[PDB]
Amino acid sequence: KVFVDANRFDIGDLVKASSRSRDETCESNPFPRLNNPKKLEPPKILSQWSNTIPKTSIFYSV
């Protein structure tokens, strides 16, 4: 009802002229983490100064 933006109230009537519908409730997908979700994409960094980064991580990732 807020981010799909074809189907808000403010903008919603205007985008239908020029799917993921508004009917969706919290019955479908009860527990998000069931092999569905993707990890958060890491923070971007400048190319020019890509060699200011600390070389080693503090903990051992998988």
Partner: protein, 539 residues
């Protein structure tokens, strides 16, 4: 008409009645709303006021059950926006921001976007952004908030000294997307084309001291300004070394793991590791000692597990011992008492905070509000902890309110007709009330002449006379009845060795003396080694 045709429809009567039967389930509140909008599908100024006033009280009653639903405060303003009264659209962002205690990102983002279009007054519209950033400015995902604020300076204002002033702040904050703000700083520094334009960066003095470049340098400037940039661009790069360490720490340790940043419901369950990182990400944020950033990172971690109490405790624990503001910790638990579903671990702590704060008239009023909840039968409760936390704090008041009725200035504690009858009614349940002996063990604690003669006759004799089976087979009972007598300061050793061995020991039955003996031996083996043989021959 369209209104009355919806009342006489069948699906309205079932979906309403379902919600009044099962309030907190949400997925019935959601169907009651998702249906009632579609049944008024053309939702313009046209549609009749009975149908709009009804669709307004669905929303406004539904947000009064679930104050942490960010999207339904947005969606309720936009419905009040399209219907066309922006007075009533503001009023329900104000009520949304106050629900989160001023510090939620999505509200302040999707308030200000709207607020650009309708404020139409310069000084006041920037005052919304100044008030915004002191709450939600350091939010780790705030990157996209500032990009609004920088869009509204460039677009609107003329001078271009505010745009440098604001952007100097965003360079010091560990945002997720910080590199999009260093790219904008470095696109300015390059486009600076006169030495006077380095005054808008930083002062005339601090240029000449910290870097040694002068604006009044009249000469052949080209290489001199080409030096100034290289000298000035450097200390950006050293700041990009500072922040990047703080970001890549926080991303790699905490934020990478946290997969859910929103509310959902009272029926949603969070993963175990997600709780584990929120507990560590909160301790890390306390270390930094950035108070705006701390309050925010509790509130930011509250709304995913707002129902547990696990974060309501810590957030009060942080405030009570670190920031040293006890009256402020009282308000957290009171705000936490509502959302959490355990409610017991809070309410034990919450009693204690009031007691230290010396607001006893509140606590006495609070104990009346929890006895009135069960209808004067807290005694009869299944979950013992609510009773036992009630009882020991109910005791502390009636020691204070009524003067003592026994010798040696002992406050007639658990022994008062008001409380003792609640306890005796609790003891009478015997097998089902399930917190018996723990209540019984605290009746031993009197240690004087008058009170031992009371608790002997008024509980330990009457429990024999009625002769309930459950209490006599449990050796924890007989053990406590011996320890009541032995530690009395009135008796000498002779009669105390007599009264127990001559009268108390024989009153047990020989069949019960199987299962009673283990707990009854332990009293004897430690305090009476001398008369350990006379125990064994009896059984």
């Amino acid at each position: 008409d369209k209104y009355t045709a919806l009342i006489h429809d069948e699906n309205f009567s079932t979906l309403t009645l379902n919600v009044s039967r099962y309030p907190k389930s949400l997925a019935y509140w959601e169907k009651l709303l998702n249906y009632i909008v579609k049944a008024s599908a053309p939702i313009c100024k046209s549609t009749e006021p009975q149908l709009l006033k009804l669709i307004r009280c669905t929303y406004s009653s539904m947000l009064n059950e679930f104050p942490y639903l960010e999207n339904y405060y947005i969606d309720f303003a936009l419905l009040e926006y399209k219907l066309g009264n922006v007075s009533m659209s503001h009023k329900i962002f104000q009520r949304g921001l106050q629900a989160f205690n001023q510090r939620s990102l999505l509200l302040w983002t999707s308030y200000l976007k709207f607020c650009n279009n309708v404020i139409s007054h310069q000084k006041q519209l920037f005052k919304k952004y100044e008030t915004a950033e002191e709450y939600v400015g350091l939010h780790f995902f705030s990157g996209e908030f500032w990009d609004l604020y920088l869009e509204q300076i460039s677009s609107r204002c003329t001078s271009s000294k505010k745009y440098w002033n604001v952007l100097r702040k965003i360079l010091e904050i560990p945002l997720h997307s910080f590199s999009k703000f260093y790219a904008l700083w470095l696109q300015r520094i390059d486009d600076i084309m006169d030495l006077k334009q380095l005054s808008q960066l930083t002062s005339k003095d601090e240029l000449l001291k910290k870097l040694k470049i002068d604006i009044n340098y009249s000469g052949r400037k080209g290489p001199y300004l080409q030096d100034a940039k290289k000298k000035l661009k450097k200390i950006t790069k050293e700041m990009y070394m500072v922040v990047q360490y703080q970001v890549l720490e926080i991303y790699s340790i905490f934020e990478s793991k946290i997969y859910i940043n929103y509310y959902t419901s009272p029926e949603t369950l969070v993963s175990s590791d997600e709780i584990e990182t929120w507990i560590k990400y909160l301790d890390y944020t306390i270390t930094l000692q950035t108070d705006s950033l701390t309050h925010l990172n509790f509130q930011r971690a509250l709304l995913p597990l707002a129902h547990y109490d696990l974060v309501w405790i810590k957030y009060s624990k942080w405030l009570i011992n670190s920031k040293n503001d006890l009256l402020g910790a009282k308000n957290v638990l009171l705000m936490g008492l509502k959302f959490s579903l355990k409610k017991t671990e809070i309410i034990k702590l919450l009693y204690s905070v009031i007691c230290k704060l010396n607001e006893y008239v509140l606590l006495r009023n609070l104990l009346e509000k929890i006895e009135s909840s069960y209808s004067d039968n807290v005694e009869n409760v299944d979950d013992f902890e609510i009773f036992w936390d009630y009882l020991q704090f109910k005791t502390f008041c009636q020691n204070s309110l009524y003067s003592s009725r026994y010798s040696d200035s002992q406050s007639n504690g658990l022994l008062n007709k008001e409380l003792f009858d609640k306890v005796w009614k609790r003891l009478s349940c015997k097998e089902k009330k399930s917190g018996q002996e723990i209540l019984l063990n605290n009746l031993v604690q009197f240690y004087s002449k008058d009170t031992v003669e009371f608790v002997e006759k008024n509980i330990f004799q009457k429990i024999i006379e009625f002769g309930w089976e459950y209490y006599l087979q449990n050796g924890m009972f007989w053990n406590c009845y011996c320890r009541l007598i032995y530690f009395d300061t009135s008796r000498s050793y002779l009669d105390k060795r007599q009264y127990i061995v001559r009268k108390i020991w024989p009153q047990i039955d020989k069949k019960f003396a199987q299962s009673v003996l283990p707990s009854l031996t332990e009293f004897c083996e430690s305090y009476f080694p001398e008369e350990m043989d006379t125990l064994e021959e009896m059984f």
